[PDB]
Amino acid sequence: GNPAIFASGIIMDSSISKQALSEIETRHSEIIKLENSIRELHD
């Protein structure tokens, strides 16, 4: 029947986002403070 047909173009989709990265900064920031605290305790 129909000859072999070409495929169409692709449309990718990035995952990470600026605001979600601000949220990841919220995640990361507290860790350093907690680290300062634990280092104090050990010292």
Partner: protein, 106 residues
């Protein structure tokens, strides 16, 4: 006061073809022609470019691309006549004649 910019297309009939003649291309072989047409002569104007194209099937190209103002000078290059053949033959043996590598009986 600007310099000249040159662009050379080779086998132009591969990308530019009559709009609608092609089918089942997913539409990618149609937006290209529109983009090219708009860019060569659009609302804004340029005055420092030059475009050269070569082909072997001149009748398949979209007509809108051959009107004056986009591709004016159309030239056909055909087979040579006797004088052309003699000139070409002279061109392609100058080195040998110069270094005496060519016999006298030719």
């Amino acid at each position: 006061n600007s310099g000249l910019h040159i662009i050379i297309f080779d086998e132009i009939d591969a990308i530019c073809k009559q709009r609608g003649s092609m089918a089942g291309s997913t539409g990618v072989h149609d937006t290209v022609v529109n983009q090219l047409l708009s860019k060569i002569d659009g609302v804004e104007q340029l005055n420092n470019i030059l475009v050269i194209g070569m082909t072997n099937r001149p009748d398949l190209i979209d007509e809108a691309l051959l009107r004056p103002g986009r591709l004016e000078v159309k030239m056909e290059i055909g087979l040579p006549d006797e004088k052309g053949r003699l000139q070409i033959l002279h061109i392609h043996t100058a080195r040998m004649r110069g270094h005496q590598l060519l016999s006298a009986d030719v």
